[model samples]
Target: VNKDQIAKDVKQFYDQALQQAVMDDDANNAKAVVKTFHETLNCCGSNALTTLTTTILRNSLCPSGGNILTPLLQQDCHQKIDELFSG
Candidate 1:
């Protein structure tokens, strides 16, 4: 998906996770959940946002440019999510 779609999904997931985390009474679990949620939200807002926007601009500006970077961007996003969950 494109940058805007990715941003929307990330925000939706973060908001839902945050609400769940807040409603739960376990302090330790809530802390962990909120921390992971924030980390994923920030990563998407920063790294993926930049990469996707730049890729879009590059593709728009240069018709001959390739689409190889999109997969790499996706991989990076997956890695971030994995780290967030595993931490």
Candidate 2:
């Protein structure tokens, strides 16, 4: 239940950011809005960090300089939120 509530909040936050990005024609501002969305949620887009922006964003959000030699998988926020609602 808590996860469901958080999913809803994430959905709302992303939706607003998308709206802001779309309404504005400038790519620079849109990128910043998207940066906030990803950074705040600590999530990547549905696809594996393919885009430069996504890659850069993820790198900035996650903790750096670890020598653990283990890889951590990032969650796709869009799909996770959808699953939370679908169930």
Candidate 3:
């Protein structure tokens, strides 16, 4: 699983995505950016972006119901993702 890689890669993308959102606030574009990033991850490879990462990340930035908080939402995203790699 390359736990080390999980923490680094996930954190970087989320951080970059968050930063982008702050700058552009274009949920659509920012989401596209994140999506593009993931496509390169593993879902395209053998191991794949891990079901855990994929599901967690998807809901983090784009959850169901449609109304939410950006800051806290991303923070929770970071926490959940980091946990998977932290171990």
- Give the candidate number with the greatest TM-score: 3
- Top candidate by lDDT: 2
Off by over 4 Å in 2: 1-26, 49-53, 56-72, 83-87
Clashing residue pairs in candidate 2 are: none
* TM-score against native, each model: 0.36, 0.40, 0.42
For residue 40, give model 1's deviation from the true position in Å: 7.0
- Candidate 2, residues 27-82, lDDT tens digits: the string is 56655766665555455443344322334534432223322221235455576567
Q: Per-residue CA lDDT of candidate 1, range 1-87, in tens?
A: 365566666656654544444445454554364455434333221245543543453332111233635435343334455454455
List where candidate 3 sits over 4 angstroms from the true fold: 25-29, 33-61, 66-75
Per-residue lDDT for 49 in model 3? 33
Cα-lDDT of candidate 2: 0.51
Model 2, TM vs. native: 0.40
Q: Between prediction 1 and prediction 2, which has the larger lDDT?
A: 2
Model 3: per-residue Cα lDDT over 16-84, one tens digit each: 664564345467776676555434331211122332333444533344332223223233444556556
